[PDB]
Amino acid sequence: TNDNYIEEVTAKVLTSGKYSTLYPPTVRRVTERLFDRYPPKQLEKEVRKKLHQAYGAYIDGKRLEKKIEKIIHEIPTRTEWEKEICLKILNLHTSTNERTVAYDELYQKIFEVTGVPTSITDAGCALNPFSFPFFTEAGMLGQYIGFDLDKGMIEAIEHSLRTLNAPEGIVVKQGDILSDPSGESDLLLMFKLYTLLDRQEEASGLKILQEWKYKNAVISFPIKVGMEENYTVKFENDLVGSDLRIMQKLKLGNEMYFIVSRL
Ligand SMILES: Nc1ncnc2c1ncn2[C@@H]1O[C@H](CSCC[C@H](N)C(=O)O)[C@@H](O)[C@H]1O
């Protein structure tokens, strides 16, 4: 039938070890999206290209977990000690590395505009869940739900959090903000993810910020003459037509943080 090519192609690429460590609904999404365009044939070659174009850079947690096992073994007021371990963990990836020397006041700065929330949602969280000594101290004692695309990374975060005896409110899982049903949060975090979304699906960043329900959302961008496209102003120009309001524009470290609210 019509719905059988999708389930067959989705399973045919999810079976291949090249594309098995990613969220199946994403493959289910790009196959259903590329179905009307291209003919029934070439679909696998068209989805494996789209996956390579968009999600090809996030396909293992083995090396990461052993990297984190070293950090928690190399160490002998204790609240400050647990930070210096999370900070060394937050330095493994370039994503959360530059945010160091800013995690000390990042959640304080954000909560000055939004208030201490009851729950934080982190889309494409990556290593950001390990910033829990900073937002729990900032007042956020609710449930933290961070999700990402690569399975192996989420497994590495899950096991490392239990080894740290982190609060059981710090939940990690796998998910895609473009294919999972619309969520609801007291504070949605899109740290260095908005521009990534517009590559995977055209004009999807503003769509997610409009479809998702949140009291407040924080969308961040890097800062880094004139040989790289400036995408911060691109986002500032994207919000002219929407009913989304910029409540505050925080510049911390090498990053710009936009606190967006729809009321
Ligand atoms: N559609 C999507 N839904 C959720 N996470 C996604 C995604 N597309 C990419 N990601 C993830 O988003 C992350 C972008 S890098 C930035 C990670 C983190 N927000 C930080 O600021 O350090 C990667 O982990 C990537 O795999």
What experiment produced this structure? X-ray
Q: Give 193 Cα–ligand 1 centroid separation in angstroms.
A: 5
- Contact criterion met (CB below 8 Å) for 133 and 87: no
Residue 182, both tokens: 């619309």
196 Cβ closer than 6 Å to some ligand 1 atom: yes
Residue 174, both tokens: 């796998």
- Contact criterion met (CB below 8 Å) for 252 and 106: yes
Residue 184, both tokens: 């609801």
Resolution in A: 3.1
CA 127 from chain centre, in angstroms, equals 9
Q: Whose structure tokens read 């949140």?
A: 214
Q: Tell which one of 135, 193, 231 to mutate to probe ligand 1, the residue whose CB is within 8 A of the most ligand atoms.
A: 193
47 Cβ closer than 6 Å to some ligand 1 atom: no
Beta strands 213-214 and 217-222 are: unpaired
Spatial strand order of the sheet with 119-123 comes to 170-174, 143-148, 119-123, 187-191, 217-222, 255-261, 245-252
Q: Which residue's C-alpha comes closest to atom 19 of ligand 1?
A: 191
Residue type, 228: E
- Contact criterion met (CB below 8 Å) for 253 and 102: yes
176 Cβ closer than 6 Å to some ligand 1 atom: yes
Annotated binding residue 108: no
Helix (H, G, I), strand (E, B) or coil at 145: strand
Residues 6+ apart with CB under 8 A from 73: none
- Contact criterion met (CB below 8 Å) for 259 and 220: no
Among the listed residues 170, 185, 201, the one whose alpha carbon sits nearest the alpha carbon of residue 260: 185
Annotated binding residue 159: no
148 Cβ closer than 6 Å to some ligand 1 atom: yes
Q: How far, CA to CA in Å, does 220 sit from each of 97, 243, 260?
A: 14, 19, 11
Q: Give 124 Cα–ligand 1 centroid separation in angstroms.
A: 3
58 Cβ closer than 6 Å to some ligand 1 atom: yes
193 Cβ closer than 6 Å to some ligand 1 atom: yes
> What is the rounded distance in angstroms from the CA atom of residue 81 to the CA atom of residue 16?
43
Q: Give 221 Cα–ligand 1 centroid separation in angstroms.
A: 12
178 Cβ closer than 6 Å to some ligand 1 atom: yes
